[PDB]
Coordinates of C-alpha atoms in Angstrom, one line a residue:
Chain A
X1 CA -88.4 -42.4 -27.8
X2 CA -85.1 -44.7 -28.4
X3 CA -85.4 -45.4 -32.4
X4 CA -82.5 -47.2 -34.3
X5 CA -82.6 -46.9 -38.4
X6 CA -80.9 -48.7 -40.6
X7 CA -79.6 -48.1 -43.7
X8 CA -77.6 -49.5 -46.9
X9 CA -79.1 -53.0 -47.7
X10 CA -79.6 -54.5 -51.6
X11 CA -78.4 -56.9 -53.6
X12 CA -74.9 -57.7 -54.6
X13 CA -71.9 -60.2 -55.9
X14 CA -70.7 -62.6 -53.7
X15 CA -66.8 -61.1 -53.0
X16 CA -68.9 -58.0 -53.0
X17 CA -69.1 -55.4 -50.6
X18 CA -72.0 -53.1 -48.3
X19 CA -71.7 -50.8 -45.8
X20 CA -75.2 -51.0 -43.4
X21 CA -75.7 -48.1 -41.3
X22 CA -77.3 -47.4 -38.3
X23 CA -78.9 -44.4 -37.0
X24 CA -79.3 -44.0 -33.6
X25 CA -81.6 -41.3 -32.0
X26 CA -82.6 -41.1 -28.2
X27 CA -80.4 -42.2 -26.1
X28 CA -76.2 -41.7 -25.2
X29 CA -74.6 -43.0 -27.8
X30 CA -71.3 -42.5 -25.9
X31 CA -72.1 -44.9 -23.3
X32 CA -74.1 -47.7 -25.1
X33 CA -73.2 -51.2 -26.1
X34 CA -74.0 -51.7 -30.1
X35 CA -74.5 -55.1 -31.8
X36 CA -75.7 -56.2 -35.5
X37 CA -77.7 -59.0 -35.2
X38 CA -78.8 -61.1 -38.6
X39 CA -81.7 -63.2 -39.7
X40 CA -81.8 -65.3 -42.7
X41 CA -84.9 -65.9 -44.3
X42 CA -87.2 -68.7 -43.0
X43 CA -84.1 -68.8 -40.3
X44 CA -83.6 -67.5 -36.6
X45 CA -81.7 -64.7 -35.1
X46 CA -78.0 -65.2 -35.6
X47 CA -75.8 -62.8 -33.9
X48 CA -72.6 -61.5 -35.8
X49 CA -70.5 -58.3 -34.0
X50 CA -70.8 -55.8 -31.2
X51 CA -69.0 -52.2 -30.7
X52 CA -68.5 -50.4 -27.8
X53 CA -68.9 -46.9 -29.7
X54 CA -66.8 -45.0 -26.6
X55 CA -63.5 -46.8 -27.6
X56 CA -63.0 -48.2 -30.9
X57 CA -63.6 -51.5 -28.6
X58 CA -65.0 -54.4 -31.5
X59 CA -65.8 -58.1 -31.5
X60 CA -67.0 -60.3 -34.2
X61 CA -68.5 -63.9 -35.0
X62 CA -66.9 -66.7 -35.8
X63 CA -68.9 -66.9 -38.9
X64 CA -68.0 -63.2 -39.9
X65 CA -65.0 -62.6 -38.6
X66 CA -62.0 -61.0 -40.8
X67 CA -64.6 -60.5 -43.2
X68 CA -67.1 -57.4 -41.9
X69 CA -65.7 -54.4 -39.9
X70 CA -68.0 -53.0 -37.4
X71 CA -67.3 -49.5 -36.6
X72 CA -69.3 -46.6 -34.6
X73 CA -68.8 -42.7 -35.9
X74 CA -69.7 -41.0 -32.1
X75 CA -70.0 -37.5 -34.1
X76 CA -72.7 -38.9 -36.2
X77 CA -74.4 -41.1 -33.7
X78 CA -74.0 -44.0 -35.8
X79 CA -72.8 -47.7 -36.3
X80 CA -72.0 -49.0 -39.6
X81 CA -71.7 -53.1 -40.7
X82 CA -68.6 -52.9 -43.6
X83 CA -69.6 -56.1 -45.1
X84 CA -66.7 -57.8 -47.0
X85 CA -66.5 -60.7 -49.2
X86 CA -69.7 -61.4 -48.6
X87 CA -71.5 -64.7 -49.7
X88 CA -74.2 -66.2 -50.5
X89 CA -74.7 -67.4 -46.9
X90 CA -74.8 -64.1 -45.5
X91 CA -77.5 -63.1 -47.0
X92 CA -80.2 -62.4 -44.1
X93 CA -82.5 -59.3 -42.6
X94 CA -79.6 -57.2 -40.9
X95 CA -80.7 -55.7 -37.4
X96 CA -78.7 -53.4 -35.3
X97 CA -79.4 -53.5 -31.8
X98 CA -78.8 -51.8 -28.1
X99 CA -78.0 -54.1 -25.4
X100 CA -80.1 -53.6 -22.4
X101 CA -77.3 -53.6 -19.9
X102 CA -79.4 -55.9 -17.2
X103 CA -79.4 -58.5 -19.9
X104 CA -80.9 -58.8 -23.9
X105 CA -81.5 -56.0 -26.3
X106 CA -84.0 -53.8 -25.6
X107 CA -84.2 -51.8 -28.9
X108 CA -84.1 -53.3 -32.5
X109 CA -84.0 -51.5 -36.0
X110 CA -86.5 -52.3 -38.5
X111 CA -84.3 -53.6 -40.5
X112 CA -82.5 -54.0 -44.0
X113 CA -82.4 -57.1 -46.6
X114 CA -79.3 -57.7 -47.9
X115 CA -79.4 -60.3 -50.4
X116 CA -75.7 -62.2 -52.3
X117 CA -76.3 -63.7 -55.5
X118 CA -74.2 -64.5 -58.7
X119 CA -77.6 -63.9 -59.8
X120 CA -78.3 -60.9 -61.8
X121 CA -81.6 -59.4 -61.7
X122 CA -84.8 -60.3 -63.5
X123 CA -88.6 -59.3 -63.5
X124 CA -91.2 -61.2 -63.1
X125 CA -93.5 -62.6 -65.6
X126 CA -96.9 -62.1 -64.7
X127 CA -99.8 -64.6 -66.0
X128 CA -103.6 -64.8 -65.7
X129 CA -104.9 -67.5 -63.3
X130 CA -108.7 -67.3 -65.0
X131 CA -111.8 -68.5 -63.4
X132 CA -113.4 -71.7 -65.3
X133 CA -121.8 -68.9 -55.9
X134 CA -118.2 -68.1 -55.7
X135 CA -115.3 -67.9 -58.2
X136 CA -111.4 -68.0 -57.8
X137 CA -109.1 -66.1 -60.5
X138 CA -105.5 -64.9 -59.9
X139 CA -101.7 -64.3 -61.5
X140 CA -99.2 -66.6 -61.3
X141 CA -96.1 -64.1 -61.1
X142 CA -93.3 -66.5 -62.2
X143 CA -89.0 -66.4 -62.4
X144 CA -88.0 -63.4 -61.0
X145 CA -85.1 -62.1 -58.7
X146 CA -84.2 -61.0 -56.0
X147 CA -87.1 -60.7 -53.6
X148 CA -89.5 -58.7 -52.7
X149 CA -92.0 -58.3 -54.9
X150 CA -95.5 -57.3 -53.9
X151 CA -99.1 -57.7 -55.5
X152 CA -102.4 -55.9 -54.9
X153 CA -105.6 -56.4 -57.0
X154 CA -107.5 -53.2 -58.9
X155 CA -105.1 -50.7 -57.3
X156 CA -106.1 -51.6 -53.4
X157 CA -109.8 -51.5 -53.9
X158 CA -110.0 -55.4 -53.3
X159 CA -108.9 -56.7 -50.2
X160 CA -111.1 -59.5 -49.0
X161 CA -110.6 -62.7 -49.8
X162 CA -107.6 -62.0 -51.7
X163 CA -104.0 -64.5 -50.5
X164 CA -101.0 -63.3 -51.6
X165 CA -98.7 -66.6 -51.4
X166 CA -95.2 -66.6 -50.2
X167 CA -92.6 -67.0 -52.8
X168 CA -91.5 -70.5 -53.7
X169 CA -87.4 -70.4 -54.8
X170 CA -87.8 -72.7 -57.8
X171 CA -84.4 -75.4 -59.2
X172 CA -83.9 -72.5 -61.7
X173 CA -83.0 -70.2 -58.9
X174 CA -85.6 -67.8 -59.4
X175 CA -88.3 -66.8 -57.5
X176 CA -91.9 -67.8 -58.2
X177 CA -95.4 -67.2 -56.5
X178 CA -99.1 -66.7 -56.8
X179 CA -101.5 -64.3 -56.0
X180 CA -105.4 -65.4 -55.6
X181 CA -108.9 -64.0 -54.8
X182 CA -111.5 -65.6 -54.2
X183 CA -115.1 -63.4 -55.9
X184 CA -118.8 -64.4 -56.7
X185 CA -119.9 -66.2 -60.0
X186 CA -121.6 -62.9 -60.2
X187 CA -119.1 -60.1 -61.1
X188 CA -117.5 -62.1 -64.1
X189 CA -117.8 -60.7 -67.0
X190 CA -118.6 -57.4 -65.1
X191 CA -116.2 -56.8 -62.6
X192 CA -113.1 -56.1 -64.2
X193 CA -110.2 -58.1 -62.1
X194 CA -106.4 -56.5 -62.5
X195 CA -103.9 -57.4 -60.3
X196 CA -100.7 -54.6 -59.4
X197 CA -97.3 -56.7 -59.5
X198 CA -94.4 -54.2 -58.5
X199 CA -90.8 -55.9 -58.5
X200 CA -89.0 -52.9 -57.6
X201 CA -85.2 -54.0 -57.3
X202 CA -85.6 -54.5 -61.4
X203 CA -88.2 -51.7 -61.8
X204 CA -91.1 -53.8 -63.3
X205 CA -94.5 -52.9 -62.5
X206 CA -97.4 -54.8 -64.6
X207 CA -100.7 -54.5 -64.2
X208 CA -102.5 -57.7 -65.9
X209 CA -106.0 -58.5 -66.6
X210 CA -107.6 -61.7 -65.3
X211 CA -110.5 -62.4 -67.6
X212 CA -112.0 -66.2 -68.9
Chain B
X189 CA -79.3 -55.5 -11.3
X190 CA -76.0 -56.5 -12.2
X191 CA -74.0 -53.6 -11.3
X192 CA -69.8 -52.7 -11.8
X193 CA -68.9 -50.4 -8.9
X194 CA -65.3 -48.3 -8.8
X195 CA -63.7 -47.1 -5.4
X196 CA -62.8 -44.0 -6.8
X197 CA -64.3 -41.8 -9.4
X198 CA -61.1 -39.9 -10.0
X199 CA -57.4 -40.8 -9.4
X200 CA -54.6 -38.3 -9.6
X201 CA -50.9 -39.6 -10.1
X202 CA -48.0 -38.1 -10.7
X203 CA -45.9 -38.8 -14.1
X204 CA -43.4 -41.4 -13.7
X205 CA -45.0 -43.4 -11.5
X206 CA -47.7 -46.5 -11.9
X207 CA -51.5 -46.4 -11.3
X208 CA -53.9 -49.3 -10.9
X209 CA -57.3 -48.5 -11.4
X210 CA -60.3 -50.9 -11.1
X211 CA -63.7 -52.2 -11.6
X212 CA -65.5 -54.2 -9.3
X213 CA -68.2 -56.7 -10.1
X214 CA -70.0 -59.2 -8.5
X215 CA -68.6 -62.9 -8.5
X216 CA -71.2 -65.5 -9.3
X217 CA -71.3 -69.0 -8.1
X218 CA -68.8 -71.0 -10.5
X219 CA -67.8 -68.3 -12.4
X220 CA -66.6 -69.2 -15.5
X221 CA -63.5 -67.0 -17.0
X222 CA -64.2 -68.3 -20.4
X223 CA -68.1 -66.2 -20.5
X224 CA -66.6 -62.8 -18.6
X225 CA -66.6 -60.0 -21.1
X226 CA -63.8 -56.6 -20.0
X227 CA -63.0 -54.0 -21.8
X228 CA -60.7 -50.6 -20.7
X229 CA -61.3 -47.9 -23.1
X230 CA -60.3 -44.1 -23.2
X231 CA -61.3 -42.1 -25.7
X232 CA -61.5 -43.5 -29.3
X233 CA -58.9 -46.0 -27.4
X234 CA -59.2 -49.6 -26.5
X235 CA -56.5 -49.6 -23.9
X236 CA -57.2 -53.4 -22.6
X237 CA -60.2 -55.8 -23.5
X238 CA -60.5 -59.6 -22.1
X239 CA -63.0 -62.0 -24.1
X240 CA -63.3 -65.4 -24.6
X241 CA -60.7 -66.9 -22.1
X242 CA -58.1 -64.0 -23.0
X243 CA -57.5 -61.0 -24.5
X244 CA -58.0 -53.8 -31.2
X245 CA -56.1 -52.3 -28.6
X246 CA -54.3 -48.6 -29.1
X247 CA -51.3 -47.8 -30.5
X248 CA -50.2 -46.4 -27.3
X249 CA -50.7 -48.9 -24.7
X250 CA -48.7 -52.3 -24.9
X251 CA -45.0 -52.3 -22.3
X252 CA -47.8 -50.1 -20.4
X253 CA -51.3 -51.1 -19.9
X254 CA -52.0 -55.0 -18.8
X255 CA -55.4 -56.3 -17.1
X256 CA -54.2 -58.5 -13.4
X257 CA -56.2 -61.6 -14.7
X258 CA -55.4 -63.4 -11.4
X259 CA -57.8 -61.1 -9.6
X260 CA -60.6 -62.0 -12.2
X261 CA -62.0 -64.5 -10.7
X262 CA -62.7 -62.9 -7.3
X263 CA -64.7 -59.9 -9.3
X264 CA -62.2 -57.2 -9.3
X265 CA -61.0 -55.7 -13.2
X266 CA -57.6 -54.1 -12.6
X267 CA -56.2 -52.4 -15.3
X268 CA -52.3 -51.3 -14.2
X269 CA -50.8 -49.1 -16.3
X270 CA -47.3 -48.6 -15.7
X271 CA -45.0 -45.9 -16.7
X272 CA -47.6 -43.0 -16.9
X273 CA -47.1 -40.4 -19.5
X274 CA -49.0 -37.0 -19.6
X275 CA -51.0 -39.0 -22.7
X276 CA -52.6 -41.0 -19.7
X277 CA -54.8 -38.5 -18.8
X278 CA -58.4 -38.6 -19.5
X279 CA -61.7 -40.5 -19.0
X280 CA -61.6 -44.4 -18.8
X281 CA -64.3 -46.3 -19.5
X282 CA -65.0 -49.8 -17.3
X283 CA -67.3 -52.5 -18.4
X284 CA -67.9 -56.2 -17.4
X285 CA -70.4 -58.0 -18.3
X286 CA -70.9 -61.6 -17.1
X287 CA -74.6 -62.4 -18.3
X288 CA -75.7 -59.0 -17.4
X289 CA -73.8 -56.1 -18.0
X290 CA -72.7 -52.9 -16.7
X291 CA -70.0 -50.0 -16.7
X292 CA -68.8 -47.2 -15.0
X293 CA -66.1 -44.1 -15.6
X294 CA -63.2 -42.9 -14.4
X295 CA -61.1 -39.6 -14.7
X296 CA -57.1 -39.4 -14.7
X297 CA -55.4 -36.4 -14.3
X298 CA -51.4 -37.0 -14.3
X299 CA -49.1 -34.0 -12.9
X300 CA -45.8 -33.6 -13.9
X301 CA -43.0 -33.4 -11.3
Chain C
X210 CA -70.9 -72.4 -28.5
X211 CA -74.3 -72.9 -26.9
X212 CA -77.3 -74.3 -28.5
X213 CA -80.4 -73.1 -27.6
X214 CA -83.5 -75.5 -28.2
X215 CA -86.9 -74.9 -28.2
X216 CA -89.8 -76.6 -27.8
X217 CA -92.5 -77.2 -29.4
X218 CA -92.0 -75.9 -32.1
X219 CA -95.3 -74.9 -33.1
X220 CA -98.2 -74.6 -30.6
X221 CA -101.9 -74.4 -31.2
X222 CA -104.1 -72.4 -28.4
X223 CA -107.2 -70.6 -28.2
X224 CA -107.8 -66.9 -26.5
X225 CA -107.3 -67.1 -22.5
X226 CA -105.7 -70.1 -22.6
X227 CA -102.3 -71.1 -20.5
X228 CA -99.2 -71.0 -22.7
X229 CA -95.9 -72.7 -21.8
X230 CA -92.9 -72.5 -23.9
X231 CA -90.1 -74.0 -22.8
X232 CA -85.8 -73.2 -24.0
X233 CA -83.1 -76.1 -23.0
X234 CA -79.6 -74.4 -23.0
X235 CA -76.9 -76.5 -24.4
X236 CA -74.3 -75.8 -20.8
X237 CA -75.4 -74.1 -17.6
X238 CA -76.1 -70.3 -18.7
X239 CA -77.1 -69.4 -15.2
X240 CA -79.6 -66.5 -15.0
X241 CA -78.5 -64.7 -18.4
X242 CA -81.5 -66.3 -20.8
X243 CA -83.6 -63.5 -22.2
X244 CA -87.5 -64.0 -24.4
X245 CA -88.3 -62.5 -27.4
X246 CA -91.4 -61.7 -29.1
X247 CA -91.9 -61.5 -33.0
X248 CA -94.3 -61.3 -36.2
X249 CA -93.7 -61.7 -39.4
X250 CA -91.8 -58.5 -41.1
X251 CA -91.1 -56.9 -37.8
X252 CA -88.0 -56.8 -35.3
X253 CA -87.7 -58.8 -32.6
X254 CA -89.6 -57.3 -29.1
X255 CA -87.8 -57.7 -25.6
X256 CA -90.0 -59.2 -23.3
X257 CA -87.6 -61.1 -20.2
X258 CA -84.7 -60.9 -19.2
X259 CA -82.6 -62.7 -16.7
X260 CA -84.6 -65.4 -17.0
X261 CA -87.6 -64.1 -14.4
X262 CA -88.0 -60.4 -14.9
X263 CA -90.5 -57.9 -17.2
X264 CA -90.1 -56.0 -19.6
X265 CA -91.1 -52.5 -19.0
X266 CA -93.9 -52.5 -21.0
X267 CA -94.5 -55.6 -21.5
X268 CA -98.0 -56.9 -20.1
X269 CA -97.9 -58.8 -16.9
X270 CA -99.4 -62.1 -19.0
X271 CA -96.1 -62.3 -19.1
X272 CA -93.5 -64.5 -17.4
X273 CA -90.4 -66.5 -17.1
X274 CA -89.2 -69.1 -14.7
X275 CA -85.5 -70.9 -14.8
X276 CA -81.9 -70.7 -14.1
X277 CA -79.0 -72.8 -15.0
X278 CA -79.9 -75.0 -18.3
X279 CA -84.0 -75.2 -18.2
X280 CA -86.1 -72.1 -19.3
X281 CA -89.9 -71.4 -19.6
X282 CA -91.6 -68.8 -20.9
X283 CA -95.4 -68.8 -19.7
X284 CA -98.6 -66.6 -21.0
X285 CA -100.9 -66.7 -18.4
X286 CA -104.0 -65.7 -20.7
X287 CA -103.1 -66.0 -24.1
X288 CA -104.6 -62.8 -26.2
X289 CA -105.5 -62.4 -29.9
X290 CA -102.1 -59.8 -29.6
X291 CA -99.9 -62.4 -28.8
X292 CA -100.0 -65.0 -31.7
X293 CA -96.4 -64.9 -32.7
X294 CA -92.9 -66.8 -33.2
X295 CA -90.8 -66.6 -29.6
X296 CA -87.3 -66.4 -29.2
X297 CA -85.2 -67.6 -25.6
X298 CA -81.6 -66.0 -25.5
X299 CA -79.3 -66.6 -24.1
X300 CA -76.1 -63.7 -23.2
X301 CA -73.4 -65.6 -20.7
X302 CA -71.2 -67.1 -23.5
X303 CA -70.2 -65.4 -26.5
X304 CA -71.4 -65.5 -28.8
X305 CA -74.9 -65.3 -27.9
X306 CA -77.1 -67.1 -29.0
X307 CA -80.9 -67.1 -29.9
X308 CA -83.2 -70.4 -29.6
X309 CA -84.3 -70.6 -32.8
X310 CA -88.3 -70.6 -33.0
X311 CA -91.8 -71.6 -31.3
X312 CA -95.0 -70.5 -33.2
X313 CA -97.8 -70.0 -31.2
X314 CA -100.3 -70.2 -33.5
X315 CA -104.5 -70.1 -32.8
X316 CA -106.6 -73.1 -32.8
X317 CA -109.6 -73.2 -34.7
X318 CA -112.8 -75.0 -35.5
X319 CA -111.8 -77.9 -38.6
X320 CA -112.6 -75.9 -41.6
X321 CA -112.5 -78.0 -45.2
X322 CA -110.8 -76.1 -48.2
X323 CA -112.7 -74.5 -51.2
X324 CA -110.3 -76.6 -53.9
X325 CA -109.9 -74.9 -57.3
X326 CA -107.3 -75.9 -60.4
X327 CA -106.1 -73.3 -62.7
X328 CA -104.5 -74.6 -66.1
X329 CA -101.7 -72.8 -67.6
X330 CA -101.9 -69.4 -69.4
X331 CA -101.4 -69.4 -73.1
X332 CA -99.5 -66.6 -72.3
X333 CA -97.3 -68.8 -70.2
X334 CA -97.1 -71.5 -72.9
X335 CA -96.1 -69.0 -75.3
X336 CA -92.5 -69.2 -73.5
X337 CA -92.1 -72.8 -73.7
X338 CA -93.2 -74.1 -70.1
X339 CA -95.8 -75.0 -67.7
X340 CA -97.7 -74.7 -64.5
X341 CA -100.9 -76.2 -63.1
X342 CA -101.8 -74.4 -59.5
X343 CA -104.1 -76.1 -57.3
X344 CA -105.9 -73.5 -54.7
X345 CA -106.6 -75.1 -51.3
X346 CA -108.6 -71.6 -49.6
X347 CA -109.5 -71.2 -46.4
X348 CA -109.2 -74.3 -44.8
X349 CA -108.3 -75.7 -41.1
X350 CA -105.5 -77.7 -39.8
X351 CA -102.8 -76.6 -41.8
X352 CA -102.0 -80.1 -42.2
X353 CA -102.7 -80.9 -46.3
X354 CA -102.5 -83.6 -49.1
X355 CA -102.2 -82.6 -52.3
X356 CA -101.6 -85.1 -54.9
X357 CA -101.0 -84.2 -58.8
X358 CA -102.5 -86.6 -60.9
X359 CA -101.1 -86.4 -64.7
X360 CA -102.5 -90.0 -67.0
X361 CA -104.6 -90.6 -64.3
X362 CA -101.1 -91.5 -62.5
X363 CA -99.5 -90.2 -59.6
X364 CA -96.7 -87.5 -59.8
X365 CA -93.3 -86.1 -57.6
X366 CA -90.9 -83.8 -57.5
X367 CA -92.2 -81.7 -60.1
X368 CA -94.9 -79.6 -57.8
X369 CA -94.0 -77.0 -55.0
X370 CA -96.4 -75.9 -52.8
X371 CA -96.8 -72.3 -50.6
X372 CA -99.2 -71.7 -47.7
X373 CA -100.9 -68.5 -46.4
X374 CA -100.0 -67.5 -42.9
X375 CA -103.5 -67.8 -40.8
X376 CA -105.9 -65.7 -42.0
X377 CA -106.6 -62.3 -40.0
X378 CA -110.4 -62.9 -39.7
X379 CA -111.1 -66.6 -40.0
X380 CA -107.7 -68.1 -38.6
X381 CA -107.3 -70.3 -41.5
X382 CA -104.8 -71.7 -44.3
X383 CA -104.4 -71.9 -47.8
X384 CA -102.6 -73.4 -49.9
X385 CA -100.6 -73.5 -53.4
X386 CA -99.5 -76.2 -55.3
X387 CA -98.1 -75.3 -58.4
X388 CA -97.5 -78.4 -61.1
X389 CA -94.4 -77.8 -63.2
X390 CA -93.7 -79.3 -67.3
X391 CA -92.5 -78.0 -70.6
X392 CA -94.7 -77.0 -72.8
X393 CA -93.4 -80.2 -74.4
X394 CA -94.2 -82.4 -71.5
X395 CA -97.8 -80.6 -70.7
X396 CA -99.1 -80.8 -74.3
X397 CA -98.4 -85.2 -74.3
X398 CA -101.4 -85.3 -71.9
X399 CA -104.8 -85.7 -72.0
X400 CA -106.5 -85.0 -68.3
X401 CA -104.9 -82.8 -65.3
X402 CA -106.2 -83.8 -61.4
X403 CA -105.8 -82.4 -58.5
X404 CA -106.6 -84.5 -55.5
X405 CA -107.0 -83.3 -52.1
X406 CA -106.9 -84.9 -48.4
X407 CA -107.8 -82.8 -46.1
X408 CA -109.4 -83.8 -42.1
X409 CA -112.3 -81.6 -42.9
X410 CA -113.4 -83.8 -46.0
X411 CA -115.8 -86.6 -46.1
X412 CA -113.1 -88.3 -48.3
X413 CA -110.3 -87.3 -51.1
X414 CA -111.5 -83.9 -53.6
X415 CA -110.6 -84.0 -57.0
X416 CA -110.3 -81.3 -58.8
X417 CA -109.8 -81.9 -62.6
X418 CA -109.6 -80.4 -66.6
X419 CA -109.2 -81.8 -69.6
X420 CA -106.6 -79.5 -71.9
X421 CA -108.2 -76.4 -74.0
X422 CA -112.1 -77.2 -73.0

């Protein structure tokens, strides 16, 4: 129906620069009301600038203002977020959203990380938590950067009783978390147990073998 | 429904001369001027926009275009744009929003004398 | 600028129950509060606005009641769809601004937690630091003890812990706590514990190893 798709997020410097985009499909974009709304991680909904695409009409933040440029190409039925001299405290889920015109928004993008960091990147180690009825066995994946990264055990064919922990932001300023399933005393030493660590924004994929 | 209403759709005006056109919204109990949001676009334009308490806007339109702010309160958006050139013609876009939101538009044709 | 706050912050109910949030605006907004609906790696979804109406869409269960500075959002039968965080708005004064939270999660039978301790890897110690993970798994409330015991004697600041959103089946928690040392640190001690509290336990779990065994 009405679908808004966003564009442009990743990682970058703080001083640094981005340009999100969004794409909007299903309804006139000549007489909408656009805003970017933001969500920091573990944080709520913060709101940061509108644009009325018709005009060049624009309004910004307190927060962000001076700094990001919101601007609307009508011809390509699409709002972009310039983001300028970003910093560390930006960093939040971007959303673009339509105002329903009786009052909220009534459509929201998916939506699109965008992460500041002095922090160059770094992939994860990946380490066998091995078991010592039922068993528990698992990886700690351990100091990497940025977030996501996402684990699955013997290439999706184990899905029960597997959690997946959130990531823990550890003094060193690197991400760290765990990944466990819990199995029966009976498939060790038959079952074989691998689990499938992907950090993508560094390109490191390991498969490691949990084993006593 | 919150809904901006215009007397007239289309206003024709010959060069020369002044024009007000407006937007009509309703006025709340205890409106507050500080949460009313205006704006008076053309085309890739912003010929007037009131947020915050007071008023990105074209090129074009300052010694011409100015919002009456003394008729805020009592719900009416007037934008008055004085001296009108031939580059006045077009499609102008109203909206107010004070907590729900709406807009409307407007043609301008301008003759010459 | 208005604050919007929230409350509670996190809720506990059960399937067909009565659900009341409730959103205190900082000044008078009048009618222009709006509710929000949303789960975890999704956008927000619209569900009132100006304060009273739906949605469309959005199932009748559904409802809002206020004006001026009080707000409540209210699910009259609470369904296994609608375990979520939930958002009041509120669009008068620029900027707007969003409430920030209430988590309705879903109550449970007390459930005690399966404990298990993993030492390090010798992978892991091959780089010069580290970490002890205690598993809490599957367990109800959310609310945990973990303690790390290191000599026999009681440690802080050197263990973080993570917890599981509730499970989709079960409805329950678990938890993470992973213990933190250099491989100088780890290697001056004797016996690692793990010692649990938990409401569903007839008293403390410990969990223990002595190194290399």
């Amino acid at each position: 129906e009405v679908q808004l798709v966003e564009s442009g997020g990743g990682l970058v410097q703080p001083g640094g620069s981005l340009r999100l985009s969004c794409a909007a499909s299903g309804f006139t974009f000549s007489d909408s009301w656009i805003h970017w709304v933001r969500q920091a991680p573990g944080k709520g909904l913060e709101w940061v600038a509108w644009i009325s695409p018709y005009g060049g009409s624009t309004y910004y933040a307190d927060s962000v203002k001076g700094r990001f440029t919101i601007s609307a190409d009508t011809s390509k039925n699409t709002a972009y977020l310039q983001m300028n001299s970003l910093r560390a405290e930006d960093t939040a889920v971007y959303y673009c959203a339509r105002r329903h015109w009786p009052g909220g928004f009534d459509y929201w993008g998916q939506g699109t990380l965008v992460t500041v960091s002095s922090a160059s990147t770094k992939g994860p180690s990946v380490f066998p938590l091995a078991p010592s009825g039922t068993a528990a066995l698992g990886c700690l994946v351990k100091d990497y950067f940025p977030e996501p990264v996402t684990v699955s055990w013997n290439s999706g064919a184990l899905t029960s009783g597997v959690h997946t922990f959130p990531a823990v932001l550890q003094s060193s300023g690197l991400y760290s978390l765990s990944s466990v399933v819990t199995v029966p005393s009976s498939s060790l030493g038959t079952q074989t147990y691998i689990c499938n660590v992907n950090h993508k924004p560094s390109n490191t994929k390991v498969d490691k073998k949990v084993e006593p | 429904a919150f809904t901006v209403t215009v007397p007239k759709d289309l206003y024709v005006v010959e060069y020369g001369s002044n024009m007000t056109i407006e937007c009509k919204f309703p006025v709340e109990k205890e409106l507050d001027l500080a949460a009313l949001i205006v704006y008076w676009e053309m085309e890739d334009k912003n010929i007037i926009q009131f947020v915050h308490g007071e008023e990105v806007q074209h090129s074009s339109y300052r010694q011409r275009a100015r919002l009456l702010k003394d008729q805020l309160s009592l719900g009416n958006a007037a934008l008055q744009i004085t001296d009108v050139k031939l580059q006045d013609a077009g499609v102008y876009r109203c909206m107010i929003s004070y907590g729900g939101a709406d807009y409307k538009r407007i043609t301008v044709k301008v003759n010459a004398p | 600028d208005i604050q919007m706050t929230q409350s509670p912050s996190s809720l506990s109910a059960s399937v067909g129950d009565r659900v009341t949030i409730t959103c205190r605006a900082s000044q008078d907004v009048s009618t222009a509060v709006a509710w929000y609906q949303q789960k975890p790696g999704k956008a927000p979804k619209l569900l009132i606005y100006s304060a009273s109406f739906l949605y469309s869409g959005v199932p009748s269960r559904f409802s809002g009641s206020g004006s001026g500075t009080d707000f409540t959002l209210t699910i009259s039968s609470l369904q296994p769809e609608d375990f979520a965080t939930y958002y009041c708005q509120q669009y008068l004064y620029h900027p707007a601004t969003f409430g920030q939270g209430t988590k309705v999660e879903i109550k449970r039978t007390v459930a005690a937690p399966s404990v298990f301790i993993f030492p390090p890897s010798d992978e892991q110690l091959k780089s010069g630091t580290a970490s002890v993970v205690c598993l809490l798994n599957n367990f109800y409330p959310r609310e945990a003890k973990v303690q790390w015991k290191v000599d026999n004697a009681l440690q802080s600041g050197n263990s973080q812990e993570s917890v599981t959103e509730q499970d989709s089946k079960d409805s329950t928690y678990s938890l993470s706590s992973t213990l933190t040392l250099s491989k100088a640190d780890y290697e001056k001690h004797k016996v690692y514990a793990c010692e649990v509290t938990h409401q569903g336990l007839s008293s403390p779990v410990t969990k223990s190893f002595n190194r290399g065994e």
